[PDB]
Symmetry: D2
Subunit: 340 residues, 4 copies
């Protein structure tokens, strides 16, 4: 089977297997014919190729124009969250405004964001010179790690970006990784894809595209948005909720066959009910991917284990019994401190 990391320190081979670099601006890229930008965006590549597990992420000092771009996006995008975004996004945004520094005059740093996430759900972030393969991104979601970029848009226009700058992974992805259920959902998508055939990693990356990127949920009646591609794009957060687009339920058996459009809107946005419903649908879709073992994530050691014999399975069951014996005692305490 193909190689996957078996401990969170071996994840540095994946984090550094970058296909294309974030300094390679394309032809249609505003700033492809610039001189000062390219140097700025080449600084970030070298700052990100110097990360190593265990060392705090260095702080980047954003200039005066970058800060204005961040503020423009923040201002123009936060005045339509209250009526378009889901509930678990609104219950988490103020905490980010309070502890990490989300304000029009400041650009959050990855150290504060990573220390804020690490205490709420367990996730952490690490910087990447952009565009690592989907196998190596899903293999990082298995350890509860998220690969971020640090650069910002071109001040040319602050509302168009053919790529994931750092304003897409702070306003789209982070406010919703601080939720335990979304964290469990993401990590399970990631664990399902460890050592799988290149033909199943594509189905999983497609399900992730249509769930954790362009997803919609209806939780009290009318539906809302919980995908990053929406929650970070003004032009597409409106279209998706205005009744001019197709919306059909989520089904991983047919949803894994779709065109992941990059520049234009989507033919159809898939809707779901709750992170638990989608988590169950995806855990059922999984186990339909051929693999000759099972994997178990150990969160004390932070390492993956291959259940393929009976000694391993016996360890897992023995550790389940000790967690059942805690419930069976919390309940006794409630009883005695009430009437039986």
């Amino acid at each position: 089977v193909p190689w996957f990391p078996r401990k969170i320190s071996e994840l540095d081979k994946c984090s550094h297997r970058v296909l294309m670099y974030g300094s390679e601006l394309d032809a249609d890229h505003p700033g492809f014919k610039d001189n000062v930008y390219r140097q700025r965006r080449k600084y970030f590549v070298d700052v990100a190729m110097g990360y190593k597990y265990g060392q705090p992420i260095p702080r980047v000092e954003y200039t005066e124009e970058e800060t204005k771009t961040w503020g423009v996006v923040f201002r123009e995008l936060s005045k339509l969250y209250p009526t378009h975004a889901c509930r678990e996004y609104l219950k988490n945004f103020p905490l980010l405004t309070k502890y990490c520094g989300y304000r029009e005059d400041n650009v959050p740093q990855l150290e504060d964001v990573s220390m804020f996430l690490k205490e709420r759900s367990g996730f952490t972030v690490r910087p990447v010179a952009g565009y690592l393969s989907p196998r190596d991104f899903l293999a990082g979601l298995a350890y509860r790690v998220f690969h971020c970029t640090q650069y910002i848009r071109h001040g040319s226009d602050p509302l168009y970006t053919p790529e994931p700058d750092t304003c897409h992974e702070l306003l789209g992805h982070v406010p919703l990784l601080a939720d335990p259920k979304f964290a469990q959902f993401s990590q399970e998508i990631g664990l399902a894809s460890l050592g799988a055939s290149d033909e199943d990693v594509q189905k999983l990356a497609t399900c992730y595209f249509f769930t954790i990127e362009f997803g919609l949920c209806k939780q009290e009646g009318q539906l809302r948005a919980y995908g990053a591609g929406l929650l970070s794009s003004i032009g597409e957060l409106k279209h998706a909720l205005s009744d001019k687009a197709c919306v059909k339920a989520f089904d991983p058996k047919t949803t894994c066959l779709q065109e992941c459009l990059i520049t234009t809107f989507q033919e159809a946005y898939f809707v779901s009910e709750s992170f638990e419903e989608a988590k169950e649908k995806m855990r059922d879709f999984a186990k339909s991917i051929t693999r000759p073992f099972s994997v178990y994530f150990n969160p004390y050691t932070q390492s993956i284990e291959i259940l393929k014999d009976t000694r391993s399975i016996e360890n897992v069951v023995q550790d389940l019994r000790s967690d059942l014996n805690t419930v069976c005692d919390a309940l006794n305490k409630m009883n005695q401190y009430l009437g039986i």
Copy 2:
């Protein structure tokens, strides 16, 4: 109830509540009438009062005499472990010789030891200016943290020590924290004592004294030693394995009432069978300690949670079901990829 830390960040208020300091050494201390020694015991206190959660532990460079003392103790203890120590100590010592640097001509560092432990059982190490209360030392084992000292004996005689030093916590305690079962045992002793009355913290500290400090086990027809007080002391390791000491079974109801002797040999020694037997006996004894809630350790967030209502208990059960599903899938794979 008494204050306890509810997240591994708040453990700095406990790690720094030191009763007496490692510089304020007793009068009976060889070196109480010295001038150069008493000035390095202050460098160590200063480096230990400067630790903060999240920063790698700085490295200490040991002089030529300190190194020779460490080597003397190492070479004098190494020729007893093969026939006196337990089985797990023996299976873990060579790995320490290979990865952390256990050998004459250098003293292991706490950074290498902490990174070696963190990958095997989950424990980590942090330096302390000595002698913090028992409540604050047990509240640190709840989070899987061990409080170590960094100084070394007085070169006068590398065989007598009335106190802990960096040779009692590298040769006595560490080689056996790298075992998952000893790690669960220690952490459960620690979790039982969170917010308990000062009269129960004493019973728990006594059980810990007679189990994890001066303990004996019989794995084959003959018994061995798995306590640090033994595995770090030549005079007492080859006295408890001899027909001149009393040895009765372990019973947390009658052993929590006994004298913890500090300078002389213990009368009784409380043999046991296995870390699992002692873990079960302690979990039975540990439901007597009066407390109006239960605690649940969350290892992703690394935080303690109070089970005292039904929403918390329902969360815990929902997380148990997902771990039962993993076993139920591992077994199906093990079947289909075999004969039913």
Copy 3:
């Protein structure tokens, strides 16, 4: 809430709350203008109104014409099972031919059938003077009891029946209650409907109509039939597997709104995958029926218990722990008798 039985002996109020009687042939009955027939349909009603929990079911001796009718139906319907019925029906029919007496010139008895079922899945059968309400028929599947009739068709026509008789509940229902997973499915449908509002018992009875009466399954490619309404009717079993019938998918949120046709074919024939996934769909749908408690079936006592406080839930968890210890020991034995 509405009254439901809380022990298998109180089920005699439900078993004897018969709406219409099996002696009341309607105008359209091919025996409505007969004289000797009715004098037998009265004997059956009388023998079925005399059953009492604990007494073996008396044996009915079928005349020469009744036996010939049974044989006609048997041999005319068994020559198209091999290519139409599911696999769990074919793996159970020979056992019935061997132990209970399925063969022409002999009509099986309910005592032999009930003793054959009681050893394979736990079900038993008891006779009923026909047509008890749906609430009272579903409250009997909660205890793993099935209400059967004992009469037979009118010999005039041996292949048309506007009602259930002893040939519909022996060739349609019984060969598939002897399966543990179909037994669990049926009992869960029954337990979901204890003390529920008359408006939910109708949705549950509809799901049961379209799953356990007219159901289809595709388990190896092409689909097959596992409903009694099909497996007991030549005309309809040979039409739902053809290409002149609309086969939709199973979804308890919509299928619970359908016309339960009694004399003509069904417009739609809902299809599924396996008793396990249909059981999961029904268990998720079955938590959207308003009820202020939960019920737990105790199979030693054979009684229902209301989980509505913490002492009951604590009992249930305490039994789960003892059932998990058995697995944790079976695995250890497999290990030691292999290599670890």
Copy 4:
């Protein structure tokens, strides 16, 4: 391995493998030189050799002298229960007085007793021509079946009995089988001994002798009696709570090596805390009996299953999951119909 029954209907080979008969009065029998008595023991033997699984137990009509003897024992023994018996005996005796007929001038019948037990704990009773081997008596507790006698003492001095008449199994054994936890304890002792070597059946029968026959418990302070040998004997129920006998703690590793006296007060009466504590000690001791498989009792089918591969263990785990869903739903109901 030795033959054991794998379904509750195969238990008729064990129930009828009687070593000596209840009509064979020995020389020391106060009725050894009688003529009318023996002709009654013959009747009881003949009626007990005619039982067959599935048929209600016939009723025995006791004469006037027999009834007066039963009344003497009842009256002389019930006036010292309130201060000597455990609490779970006192909370069950009145129910027996109410439903089964415990009172002078009436001797309870085994049909009423068996139908009263079957609804409280699951046990049932069946008559035996006395003295079947210990292997065959323990293989009957695995299925929750108890083998009783139906005869009564000789009216001459109705206070001495060198054997278990029907007054020892109604006043000693039955009032405490109607408790769910004592029923679980007994059945586990019985299941531990299925297909074991004749040298372990002796240790298990000894533990049963010193726990379920001559046992004592301390549950609120001073200790009480819960064994049948005590609760049915005036002379020995007094020489157990008055301090003239040696009371030692219960330990299945040493108590399984003691001598069971038949006509003389036991030199030592073992004491315990609760049926759960003794159940745990026995499940621990029951791991050191050599056997190459595990057994699982299925209570719907009422049959034993050999866990020796992975398909069986997978079935068991799959049922555990469904039993855990019920708890996870009961807790949600409590939350909802309360405050979160």
